[PDB]
């Protein structure tokens, strides 16, 4: 972070208490992209220089700190003749004499410990992969959602033209049309409202295929909808290495890394990933 | 061998799958005894048959006919009986008929190579249309066994198998005739693997692939025993997977659309 | 080369009698004496070393028991005889500490291990569920708004053309529509009510679905955490004291014992003689935690026995060190050891070598009656709660 | 489904919730005790035996929160005999070589093969797998047509064959399957001396018969004869379903003259 | 899953002298239970549910 304007650090108390410990910065100041400038002094702090004041203060250190010129880690090749073959960044700045310990997230390698010494390790760790979540949709609006338009018009049509056989039924038989057509729309809707019966021996027949209708309909209808408010099957991820996509690009799945950096040096160590 | 490959085509089933047809039916007989054994018991104490039914079959589809009921105090313990598994059939029907009724169908266009479909192109709708690419043994073989084809397929003979993959998703043509370990190696390769060979991968002639040698050459005897010594130590069987390895595996909609409903009026019907 | 039988790392067994040598796929390795054939994952990795630089060895099985400790003026074990010149290297099952790196060195470390902690499976609870987890409270005092200002709209169209009987039909419609109805011959009325008939058929799909699965036990009741828990602080505490325990004599008790004093002295009537005999020691309800590394520990737990063996916090290790290969502390192998390792984390060579050596297997119940008591317990609150209301109220009648 | 403890709780609880209804009707400002029965049981099972609901104010309450435990009862049963029914899907299934299972040796199930068969020539040169069957060189059935009869009585799990002669196998017993993938592929061959003048013409009629289609007609009339190739429940469960209404159908009969014993 | 098992580390040059306590010096920082304090503070604190 950017220091005072006097040029000094803020005081910022943790939640637990003490402040954290802070201590000046020297480093470059826009990034040198291209535009490089001068050199003004910074707030470095956090939990690797928290463990750099440990060290100081057991074995009698006097340190100073500064930041890499450019920003990349460090990796040997050549440069302008293809005949140059050397180190850069953070790396190459310890091999010239311009400073003798390194703190930072380095990556102990074997194609970079030949010319350093590595002390042993802060933490352990490995790699994996970051991706975004996918977006949850649930339109729970209801209101028969699940249910298309299409079979809502005939169906809603059902009950109206085969109530009226009923009384078309009673014409020959061996009560209106309108107190008939109350018990078929009363049985489909499972209502406590019913009077009436049909007379004749045939009408109860059409009043019994009738009533498998109610039961069939409402509760497979109450059933698509269990699935619905469940579902829950989203598969995105690319379960780690040896990914099928990742073996050969379908030009959709874009994936960057940090150039020089470590993991670089890892793909080009190999050979059977040479593809993408 | 020899493949097709066409593109994947866009069900009445049985709305009442769930138990099975055997043990279902000879439940209706039941409900005539069942109903029997009441009008012994509403003999005593202070038309039944006929009103028996209505009486019982209306209890099974929960309860929203006008039903009677019999008087008495012993006349109403049975169907106090019969009510307890009213809900358990009812339990059984809702447990998973939904989601066997979205159940789809693996559709098929073509019987195979020799489909009687193939024979004659032009005797049934719109003109049938498959090809391949001459110079070559699939074309050789077709010409040998199969000649009244043979006038056909030529209208249609593709640059390369590239361009036959782009134009299939079209409508020109619907089918393909190539090498077999080309074909699925395109195959189990394309965007939700929606392009599947006939019949799920059948080959039709099982030669395999070699290296030709000058004749009578005497690198033929040992260069053979190198290979079969590969095939012992798993090369080939790891190596293959580095290069002829798919992405995808030949395997909601909260719809219903008639799909299978049509039955439910059929019974209607 | 000094070596030990560790489970994972270093199997012995006897040579095959019939051929009167070791079978293949292994190296000699003697006692001090009994021919024995010895193989692991440890072994594996000295081949690649041997070749890669190129010398002779000669297993040397250590009689001495344990791994070393210091007895106040020696060592024993595989440090020991490293220390006094007898063995450059022991490969085995070696932690690196501070008291060791400082008589020899070490190689880089290849496999991480700390501290872990192993209790038995713990029996599910699931408490009462606040209304059968539904949509909130919101939606129980929702219901009673329309409801109530739905039947005065129907009783002002019913004079038009009984509101105490007017509440009992329109309400037990929604709840399975079994008990006996009075119905109103009003025909503007008679049309309404099916249009509120219809909301009770979908008000089911909010009460049926969803609440099948979340009824079962939950919330995992997996309880007392690591070593920062009061309860290992406290020996005694509320309940039968606690039963941990440890095998003594190695790296992980000089650890605890320094580091955290009024524990080691507890526990010393808690200890193990071995390692598989301990876990016997645990099952059945003798003992309930272990403390011991987390590389043996976590093999086995995967292992398991009926995948009921887990560890506390889901691996939550402590006093993060590795292993690694120790040298004769002026042995100058070490540069050519270190780089070599390194280049195996570099390939995948140590990613499948840990597949062939450590794998494990494994990592719906009866619905009872105590999980879901609270169902009932409406009953029984409803029931007295209802008796004050309605015995009180003709008594201020009668008077 | 609610073990037994609830069952006999539920039982209880509908007797208790009969007697005090017609207490909290008697002594108060018009019902006999033969409704509670009626009343108790009908709400439960959704029927319409019951006769009339209570005629007062003090119970008025009961049925409501009575009905409740009808909805919550009949809720839970259908949630959770559905989730057997689909979710509930455990099962091992060996899969592939490269499992760890093959790797370690086995004591539930064995390996074994065919003595002196290709497989014995496979897994003696490879020192990797030289592990388990220099373990399981005890069991090494003499013939591959006993051995699958070994299996059909559950006592060999792993057997190591061709494809081509256990996958017809299943084809025939309605009861075997195969699982995973091949890995050894290698197909068969007439075999014959060295220097025999007939091993240049019979591998050519080998070939012309590949194309020509014969040996389509063999592999169909042979190999594949086809025979045959899960919510359809039968007397297995279900038979049980529809015998205690059946055996209440002739539980009743005596106990008319247990009913017509009030007439004297 | 992780597919590249190699830790963090500080590094110099190798004539430094500066070795032999700085590795003994973090190999003691583990066992103190120092590094939990850290990692606590200045890792794994915050929460989003
Ligand atoms: C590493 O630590 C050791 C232990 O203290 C140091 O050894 C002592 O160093 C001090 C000052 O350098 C001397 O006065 C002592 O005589 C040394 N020996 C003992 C036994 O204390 C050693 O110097 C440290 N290394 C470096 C590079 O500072
Ligand atoms: C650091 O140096 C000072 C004096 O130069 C003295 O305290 C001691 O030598 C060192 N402090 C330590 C080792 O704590
Ligand atoms: C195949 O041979 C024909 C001649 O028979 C020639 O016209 C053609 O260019 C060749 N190539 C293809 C792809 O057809
Ligand atoms: C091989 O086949 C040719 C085909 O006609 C025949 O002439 C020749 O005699 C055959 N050779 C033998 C050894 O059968
Ligand atoms: N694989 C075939 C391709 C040519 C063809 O289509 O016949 C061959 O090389 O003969
Ligand atoms: N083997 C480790 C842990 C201690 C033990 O296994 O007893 C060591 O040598 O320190």
Not at chain 2, 90 to 118: C, P, R, W
Not at chain 2, 139 to 157: C, D, L, S, T, V
Not at chain 4, 99 to 124: C, E
Request: charged fraction near 20%; charge should be neutral; include cysteine.
């Amino acid at each position: 972070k950017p220091t005072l304007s006097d040029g000094t650090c803020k005081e910022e108390f943790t939640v637990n208490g003490d402040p954290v410990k802070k201590v000046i910065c020297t480093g470059p100041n826009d990034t040198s992209p291209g535009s490089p400038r001068h050199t003004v002094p910074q707030c470095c702090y956090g939990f690797c220089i928290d463990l750099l004041i440990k060290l100081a203060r057991t074995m009698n250190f006097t340190y100073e700190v500064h930041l890499v010129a450019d920003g990349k880690f460090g990796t040997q090749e050549r440069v302008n003749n293809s005949n140059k073959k050397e180190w850069n960044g953070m790396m190459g700045e310890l091999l010239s004499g311009q400073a003798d310990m390194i703190v930072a997230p380095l990556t102990i390698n074997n194609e970079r410990a030949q010319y350093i010494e590595f002390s042993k390790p802060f933490k352990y760790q490995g790699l994996t992969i970051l991706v975004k979540k996918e977006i949850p949709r649930s339109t729970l609006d209801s209101f028969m959602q699940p249910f298309q338009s299409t079979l809502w018009l005939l169906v809603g049509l059902s009950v109206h033209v085969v109530a009226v056989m009923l009384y078309l039924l009673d014409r020959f038989s061996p009560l209106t049309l309108s107190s008939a057509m109350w018990f078929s729309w009363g049985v489909l809707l499972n209502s406590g409202i019913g009077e009436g019966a049909p007379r004749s021996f045939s009408a109860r027949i059409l009043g019994m295929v009738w009533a498998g209708f109610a039961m069939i309909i409402v509760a497979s209808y109450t059933a698509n909808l269990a699935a619905f408010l469940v579902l829950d099957r989203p598969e995105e991820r690319i379960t780690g290495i040896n990914d099928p996509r990742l073996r050969n690009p379908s030009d959709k799945f874009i994936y960057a890394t940090v150039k020089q950096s470590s993991v670089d040096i890892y793909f080009r160590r190999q050979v059977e990933l040479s593809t993408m | 061998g020899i493949s097709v490959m066409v593109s994947r085509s866009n069900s009445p089933s049985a709305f009442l799958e769930p138990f099975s047809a055997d043990v279902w039916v000879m439940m209706f007989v039941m409900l005539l005894i069942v109903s029997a054994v009441a009008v012994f018991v509403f003999e005593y104490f202070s038309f039944t048959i006929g009103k028996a039914i209505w009486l019982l079959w209306g209890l099974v589809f929960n309860n929203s006919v006008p039903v009677q009921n019999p008087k008495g105090t012993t006349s109403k313990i049975m169907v106090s009986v019969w009510a307890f598994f009213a809900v358990i059939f009812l339990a059984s029907y809702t447990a998973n008929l939904a989601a066997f009724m979205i159940q789809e169908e693996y559709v098929d266009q073509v019987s195979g190579l020799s489909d009687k479909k193939f024979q004659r192109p032009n005797d049934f709708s719109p003109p049938f249309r498959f090809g391949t690419v001459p110079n070559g043994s699939t074309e050789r073989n077709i010409r040998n066994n199969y000649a009244e084809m043979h006038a056909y397929m030529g209208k249609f003979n593709q640059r390369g198998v590239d361009d036959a993959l782009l134009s299939l998703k079209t409508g020109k043509l619907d089918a393909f005739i190539y090498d077999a370990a080309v074909l699925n190696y395109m195959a189990g390769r394309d965007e939700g693997c929606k392009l599947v060979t006939i019949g799920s991968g059948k080959v039709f002639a099982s030669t395999g692939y070699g290296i030709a040698i000058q004749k009578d050459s005497g690198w033929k005897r040992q260069v053979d025993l190198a290979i079969l010594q590969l095939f012992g130590d798993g090369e080939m069987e790891e190596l293959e997977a580095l290069w002829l390895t798919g992405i995808c595996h030949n395997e909601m909609s909260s719809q219903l659309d008639i799909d299978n409903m049509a039955g439910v009026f059929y019974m209607l019907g | 080369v000094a070596t030990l039988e560790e489970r994972p790392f270093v199997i012995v067994e006897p040579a095959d009698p019939i051929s009167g040598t070791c079978i293949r796929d292994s190296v000699p390795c003697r006692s001090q004496p009994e021919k024995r054939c010895c193989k692991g994952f440890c072994i594996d990795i000295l081949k690649r070393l041997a070749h890669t630089i190129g010398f002779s060895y000669d297993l040397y099985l250590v009689t001495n028991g344990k791994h070393g400790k210091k007895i106040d003026g020696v060592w024993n074990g595989m440090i020991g005889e490293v220390f006094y010149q007898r063995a450059d290297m022991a490969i085995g099952s070696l932690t690196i500490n501070e008291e060791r790196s400082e008589i020899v060195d070490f190689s880089v470390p290849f496999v991480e291990t700390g501290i872990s902690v192993m209790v038995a499976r713990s029996n599910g609870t699931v408490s009462p569920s606040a209304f059968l987890e539904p949509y909130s409270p919101a939606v129980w005092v929702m219901m009673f708004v329309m409801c109530l200002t739905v039947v005065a709209v129907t009783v002002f169209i019913f004079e038009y053309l009984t509101i105490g009987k007017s509440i009992w039909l329109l309400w037990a419609l929604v709840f399975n529509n079994s008990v006996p109805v009075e119905n109103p011959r009003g025909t503007t009325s008679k049309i309404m009510v099916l249009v509120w008939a219809f909301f009770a058929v979908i008000f089911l799909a909010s009460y049926t679905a969803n609440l099948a699965a979340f009824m079962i036990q939950e919330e995992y009741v997996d309880t007392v955490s690591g070593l920062s828990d009061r309860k290992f602080q406290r020996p005694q505490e509320q309940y039968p004291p606690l039963k941990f325990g440890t095998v003594p004599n190695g790296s992980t008790e000089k650890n605890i014992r320094s580091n955290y004093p009024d524990m080691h002295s507890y526990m010393v009537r808690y200890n193990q003689p071995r390692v598989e005999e301990a876990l016997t020691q645990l099952k059945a309800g003798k003992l309930d935690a272990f403390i011991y590394d987390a590389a043996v520990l976590n093999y086995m737990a995967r292992k398991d026995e009926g995948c009921k063996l887990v560890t506390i916090g889901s691996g939550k290790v402590f006093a993060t060190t590795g292993y690694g290969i120790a040298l004769h502390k002026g042995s100058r192998w070490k540069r050519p050891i270190d780089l070599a390792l390194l280049q195996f984390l570099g390939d995948d060579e140590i990613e499948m070598l840990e597949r062939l050596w450590l794998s494990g297997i494994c990592h719906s119940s009866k619905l009872d009656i105590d999980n879901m008591a609270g169902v009932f317990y409406m009953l029984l609150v409803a029931m007295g709660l209802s008796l004050l209301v309605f015995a009180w109220e003709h008594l201020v009648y009668w008077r | 489904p609610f073990q037994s403890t609830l069952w006999l709780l539920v039982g209880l609880s509908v007797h208790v919730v009969a007697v005090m209804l017609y207490l909290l009707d008697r002594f108060s400002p018009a019902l006999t005790l033969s409704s509670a029965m009626w009343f108790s049981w009908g709400v439960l099972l959704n029927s319409g035996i019951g006769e009339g609901a209570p005629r007062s104010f003090s119970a008025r309450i009961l049925g409501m929160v009575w009905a409740g435990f009808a909805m919550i009862i009949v809720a839970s049963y259908t949630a959770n005999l559905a989730a057997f029914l689909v979710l509930d899907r455990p099962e091992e299934r060996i899969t592939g070589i490269n499992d760890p299972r093959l790797r370690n040796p086995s004591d539930k199930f064995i390996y074994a093969t065919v003595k002196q068969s290709s497989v014995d020539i496979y897994f003696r040169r490879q020192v990797e797998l030289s592990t388990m069957y220099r373990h399981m060189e005890k069991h090494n059935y003499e013939s591959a047509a006993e051995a699958i009869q070994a299996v059909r009585d559950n006592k060999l799990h792993a057997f190591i064959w061709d494809s081509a002669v256990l996958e017809f196998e299943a084809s025939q017993k309605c009861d075997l399957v195969t699982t995973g993938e091949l890995f050894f592929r290698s197909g068969f061959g007439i075999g014959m001396r060295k220097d025999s003048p007939w091993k240049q013409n019979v591998s050519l009629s080998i070939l012309k018969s590949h194309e020509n289609g014969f040996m389509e007609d063999l592999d169909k009339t042979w190999v594949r004869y086809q025979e045959c190739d899960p919510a359809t429940l039968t007397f297995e469960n279900m038979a049980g379903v529809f015998m205690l209404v059946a055996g209440g159908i002739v539980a009743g009969i005596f106990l008319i003259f247990i009913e017509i014993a009030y007439k004297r």
